[PDB]
């Protein structure tokens, strides 16, 4: 079975070096091509550059020309990218994948990179105070660093109109996540809401009630 | 500057049929190379589903197929399932500076379930925050479909792109989709303003919710 695998997910921090890899297996690696692409968060694939393992002949995309080394050692059947000086920017999905007869037939599984300049840090708990007689509330769950954090709702009794969004990597190199629930606006001061916060790179537990406005 | 040129989206329903064209210059496509086509789902690494021009690897279902002529590069598939949901890209060899080059992509929306417009919903900076030294404005956009919104945030009238994280949509438990768009801001930035907007846009109609320092 043609398979290419790649070195695990990065956490690195802006001006590090990194080189991560991508190893063939069941055919001749010499013999044809590997690529690598960039998709990051959201948008295109993005072609960085490609090599030729026999003669170790490499080309690149302009966008990518002197900011990456793509190289390889056929001998272990493995290729190559590498930064010298990370960029915050560069923050990415990384693909391998090989150029054969059917063109990009075989693709590396993907390596993660996450560059920030952030270390491990503890999320600030903001309350987001409150449509067909419901209300909307939630907890801002501000700057923290790495993934993951998790969310629950008053200790998780609170399941229903629940969403707990995504996270934003910030230009910062921080997270920042919401988690937001729908609920009765007759309950509101009756009923006591509490999102629970748990972080645990940073070994951070908060509890915030969230309370109505009143004006 | 070899370029290759899709359509941001295409859309339609369970059974139907859609096409997705790729369009090239003359160092790409003109020069006679033949385009690819490339299938990635959610969370996933892309699949090869079309190789010179027209050919299917095995497993690939004969519902896919692809074409091109002269300068343009078409992909169809018919019969269209949920799982068929995706983004699409053509690619293609060139002579140019770059050796390979891929087109901007396609995401395929399969309208299995009604279009709705979404829910705004915009906080304003906490006081917590703010005695923090800090400001976010927090814009919560809910149960919408398709899963694509545009967000723009106003200062007053004026359009504001520093400082403003946007997340992709994703699932909501009930199916439908949400996303939240955040503008940060300098305790005095939001002060100083008469107030800030967040402006959704989903299917070409613009929902907006506005917040003011002076309110309550």
Not at chain 1, 182 to 210: A, E, R, W
Not at chain 2, 14 to 34: A, E, K, L, M
Not at chain 2, 78 to 95: I, M
């Amino acid at each position: 079975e043609v398979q290419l695998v790649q070195s695990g997910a990065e956490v690195k921090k802006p001006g590090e070096s990194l080189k991560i890899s991508c190893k063939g297996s069941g055919y001749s690696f010499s013999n044809y091509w590997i690529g690598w692409v960039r998709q990051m968060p959201g948008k295109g694939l993005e072609w960085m550059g490609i090599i030729d393992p026999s003669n170790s002949y490499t080309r690149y995309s302009p966008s990518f020309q002197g900011q990456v080394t793509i190289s390889a050692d056929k001998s272990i059947s493995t290729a190559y990218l590498q930064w010298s000086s990370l960029k915050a920017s560069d923050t990415a999905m990384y693909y391998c994948a090989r150029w054969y007869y059917k063109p990009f037939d075989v693709w590396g599984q993907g390596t993660l990179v996450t560059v920030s300049s952030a270390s491990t840090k503890g999320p600030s708990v903001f309350p987001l105070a409150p449509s067909g007689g419901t209300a909307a509330l939630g907890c801002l769950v501000k700057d923290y660093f790495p993934e993951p954090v998790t969310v629950s709702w008053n200790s998780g009794a609170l399941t229903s109109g629940v969403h707990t969004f995504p996270a934003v990597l910030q230009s910062s190199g921080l997270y920042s996540l919401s988690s937001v629930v729908t609920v009765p606006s007759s309950s509101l001061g009756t009923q006591t809401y509490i999102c629970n916060v748990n972080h645990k790179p940073s070994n951070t537990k908060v509890d915030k009630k969230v309370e109505p406005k009143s004006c | 500057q070899s370029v290759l040129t899709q359509p941001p989206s295409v859309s339609g329903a369970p059974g139907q049929r859609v096409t997705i064209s790729c369009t090239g210059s003359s160092s790409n496509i003109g020069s006679g190379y033949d385009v690819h086509w490339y299938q990635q789902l959610p969370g996933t690494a892309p699949k090869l589903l079309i190789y010179g021009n027209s050919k299917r690897p095995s497993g690939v279902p004969d519902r896919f197929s692809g074409s091109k002529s002269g300068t343009s590069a078409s992909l169809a598939i018919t019969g269209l399932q949920s799982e068929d949901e995706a983004d699409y890209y053509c690619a293609s060899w060139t002579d140019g500076l770059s050796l390979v080059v891929f087109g901007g992509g396609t995401k395929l929306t399969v309208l299995g379930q009604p279009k709705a417009a979404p829910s705004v919903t915009l906080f304003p900076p906490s006081s917590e925050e703010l005695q923090a030294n800090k400001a976010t404005l927090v814009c919560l956009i809910s149960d919408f479909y398709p899963g694509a919104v545009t967000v723009a945030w106003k200062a007053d009238s004026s359009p504001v792109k520093a400082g403003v994280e946007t997340t992709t949509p994703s699932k909501q438990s009930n199916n439908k989709y949400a996303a939240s768009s955040y503008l940060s801001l300098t305790p005095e930035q939001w002060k100083s303003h008469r107030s800030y907007s967040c402006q959704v846009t989903h299917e070409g109609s613009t929902v907006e919710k506005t917040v003011a320092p002076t309110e309550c």
